[PDB]
Every structure is written in C-alpha cells, then in structure tokens.
Paper text:
LPMOs are reducing agent- and O2-dependent copper metalloenzymes now classified as auxiliary activity families AA9–AA11 and AA137–11. Extensive spectroscopic and structural studies on LPMOs have shown that the enzyme’s active site contains a single copper ion, which is coordinated by the amino terminus nitrogen atom, by a side chain nitrogen atom of the N-terminal histidine, and by the side chain nitrogen atom of an additional histidine, in a structural motif known as the histidine brace. What is distinctive about LPMOs is that they oxidatively rather than hydrolytically cleave polysaccharides producing saccharides with oxidized ends. We report herein a study into the principal structural and electronic factors of the reactivity of two AA9 LPMOs with a range of substrates.
To understand better how protein structure might influence the similarities and differences in CvAA9A and LsAA9A substrate cleavage patterns, the X-ray crystal structure of CvAA9A was solved. The Cu-coordinating amino-acid residues are MeHis1 and His79 (with equatorial distances to the Cu ranging from 2.0 to 2.1 Å), while a non-coordinating Tyr169 occupies the axial position (2.6–2.8 Å). No exogenous ligands are evident within 3.0 Å of the Cu-ion indicating that the active site is mostly in a photoreduced Cu(I) state. A ‘pocket-water’ is bound in an H-bond network with the amide-nitrogen and oxygen of Asp76 and MeHis1, respectively. The active-site geometry of CvAA9A thus closely resembles that of LsAA9A. However, there are some amino-acid differences in CvAA9A compared to LsAA9A at subsites +2 and −1. All three of the subsite +2 substrate-binding residues in LsAA9A (Asn28, His66 and Asn67) are different in CvAA9A (Thr28, Arg67 and Val68). For example, LsAA9A’s preference to cleave Cell4 into Cell2 (as shown for NcLPMO9C18), compared to the product profile of CvAA9A of Cell3, Cell2 and Glc, could be attributed to binding cleft interactions at the +2 subsite. This is because, though CvAA9A shares the same fold, active site co-ordination and overall structure with LsAA9A, it lacks all three of the subsite +2 substrate-binding residues in LsAA9A (Asn28, His66 and Asn67). Crystals of CvAA9A were soaked with Cell3 and Cell6 oligosaccharides but this did not result in any catalytically relevant complex.
Residue numbers in the entry: 1 to 224
Write the structure that this text describes.
Amino acid sequence: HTRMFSVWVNGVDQGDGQNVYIRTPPNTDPIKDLASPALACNVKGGEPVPQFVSASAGDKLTFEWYRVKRGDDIIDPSHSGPITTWIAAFTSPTMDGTGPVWSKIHEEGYDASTKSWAVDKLIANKGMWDFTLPSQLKPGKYMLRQEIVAHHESDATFDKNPKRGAQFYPSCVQVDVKGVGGDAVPDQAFDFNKGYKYSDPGIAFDMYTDFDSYPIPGPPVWDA
Ligand SMILES: [Cu+2]
C-alpha cells in the first residue's frame, strides 16, 4: 500500500500534487486484476486533474511516494519488487492510459549483489524515486506512469487465487514537456491489459525460493 505525494523537477519540489497534477486514486489499494482498465492509471486514471508538471526534456524527475503520511515508512517492507516508469502521449484529458500507448523509460528490479529490490531503495530514500526524462523527447504534453509491483503474494496468480497475486501500484502524472530540441516520439505502444499476463515469470514470481534474478515485465527501456 502506497501512493504519490508530489513530483520534484531537478530537486525542486513542485508541491502536493494529489488531484492537482497526479491522478490520485482514492486510496492506496493495489490493482491485481490484469484485465482491469485501472491497471494503467489506477482507479481515477480517466479523471483529469487541472495542472501539468512543468519540465524539460533531460530533466531529473523525482516521484515521491508515501503510505499514510508524507515522509513515513512509504510502503510495508514485505512488498518487495520492481519500480518502473513509463510515458504516453497526452491524447485528451479523458484518456485513461488504456490501449497501445506506453513506452518504458526507466526500471529497477532485483539487485543480486545486495539481495535487495527497487522497493528497499525507495524506502531507504524516504519515498523519493528518481529518473530522467529522455533528452531527445519531443516537446508536448505527456502522461508519466510510475509503478511499484509488490511480490509478497506473487507465488500465486490472481486468476487462480484472487486472494493472492502480484500487487500493482500505478500512479499517473500529467507533464508538460519543453524540448531541448529532440523530436523522438515514444513508440513502443505497450498496452498493459494486453502485455501484462499471468504467465509472465515477472508476475507469476515466487520470491520465497533461491532465485538469482528477476525478469522485469514489459519491453526494454525505450531507445530514440
Ligand atoms: Cu500493500
């Protein structure tokens, strides 16, 4: 259980973004059904919010997460898993993130050398998760998506056992990107409801065995 508080642009806190520039869900509950239209942007994913984070291609963004209060324990430390960041064109304010529209721009999963996950790093960083907006990005409005996946119950799949299954915590942020040039348009066209499957070894994942690696679902990080 976790959700976003705000976005920071090159270290500068843009301030509480909840229902302002983040499409904040009503609570911290996970998405588990891979056929849910909420998988892309969570339950209020289709409801527009009035502001866009102002940023430039190349900027370092920080997405800040919390559990119940800003700057708390962030997420239960049992919720080990990856954290991925994605981008889609802002087609209209009533878009909900469904369809073949996403490109992955950043990911972190399991680090064998420290036996730790993206989630442990998030906790250690007090909920701050950094990534770069690709410098080649064409200016325009975009939806950014960041997702924590918790694998404490991923040793079963939701379709067989709806009490268990991977837990997805997607957050969608509206961003208005100034270019530094660059004309690259995100083109992986990844669809979550089609591309995340119960057969994926990164979703049907048993963390309670002696694994050396974790396969992060979806395509590799977008090129240019
Ligand atoms: Cu939880």
